[PDB]
Write a protein that binds this ligand. Structure first.
Ligand code: HEM
Length: 180
C-alpha cells in the first residue's frame, strides 16, 4: 500500500534528542489491512557532519525470523528527515548484500524528547512503495511513550488506539547489535 505523501520535514525539533542511544518501537501503525505479520524493531541512529548512519533490526513475530540492515544518507537541511540507502548485514554487522541503489527509505521525525520519539518511515524499492509505518519509539524496551510524543501522534492525524503495541508480541531483540 503506497506511502502517505502528506509527511513533511519539521523545523524546530532537537536532533540531539533523536540521534541518541537506541530506539525500540513500542507502537506501530501500518494502515494496510492486507498485512498479517507483526514486527518488533529496534535501531540506533547517529549523525556526523550531515551524514546519518543507523543500524536497524526487524523481528517478524509471526514467522520468528529476523533481519538486519545498515542505512546511510544525508540529513536534510529543511528539517529532521533523511533518505537512506540500506545494506543487509548479519548480526555481526558483516555485509551480506550491498545496497540496491534503486531502493531507499525516507525517515521523518515528528517529535523527539529525552525518552521517546515519533517517526514515519517510507520504504521504496525503485518505483514500488514497500510501504510506510508510523512508529512510536522509546529508549527502553516496553516503556511508556511520553505525553509529548503521544500528543504528536494525535497531531499527526492519527489515533494511538489503532497502533499495534509491541510489548505483548513476544519480541526477540538483539541488543548487542544496537548497543553503543
Ligand atoms: C514495528 C515497526 C516496523 C514494521 C511493522 C516494519 C515492517 C516492515 C516490513 C513488513 C518489511 C518487509 C520485510 C520483507 O518482506 O522483507 C520491512 C522492511 C524494511 N523496513 Fe521496516 N518495519 C518497521 C520498522 C522499521 C524502521 C524503524 C525502519 C527504519 C529505521 C524500517 C526500515 C525498513 C527497511 C529499510 C526495510 C527493507 C529491508 C530490506 O529489504 O533489506 N522499518 N519493514
Amino acid at each position: 500500500m503506497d506511502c502517505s505523501t502528506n509527511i513533511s520535514p519539521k523545523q524546530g525539533l532537537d536532533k540531539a534528542k533523536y540521534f541518541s542511544g537506541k530506539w525500540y518501537v513500542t507502537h506501530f501503525l501500518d494502515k494496510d489491512p492486507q498485512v498479517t505479520d507483526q514486527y518488533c524493531s529496534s535501531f540506533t541512529p547517529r549523525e556526523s557532519d550531515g551524514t546519518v548512519k543507523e543500524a536497524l533490526y526487524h523481528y517478524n513475530a509471526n514467522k520468528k525470523t529476523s533481519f538486519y540492515n545498515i542505512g546511510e544518507g544525508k540529513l536534510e537541511s529543511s528539517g529532521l528527515q533523511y533518505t537512506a540507502k540500506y545494506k543487509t548485514v548479519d548480526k555481526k554487522k558483516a555485509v551480506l548484500k550491498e545496497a540496491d541503489e534503486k531502493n531507499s527509505y525516507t525517515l521523518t521525525v515528528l517529535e523527539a524528547d529525552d525518552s521517546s520519539a515519533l517517526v514515519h518511515i517510507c520504504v521504496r524499492e525503485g518505483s514500488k512503495d514497500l510501504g510506510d509505518v508510523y512508529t512510536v519509539l522509546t529508549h527502553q524496551k516496553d516503556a511508556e511513550p511520553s505525553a509529548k510524543v503521544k500528543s504528536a501522534v494525535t497531531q499527526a492525524g492519527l489515533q494511538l488506539s489503532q497502533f499495534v503495541g509491541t510489548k505483548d508480541l513476544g519480541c526477540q531483540y538483539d541488543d548487542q547489535f544496537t548497543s553503543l
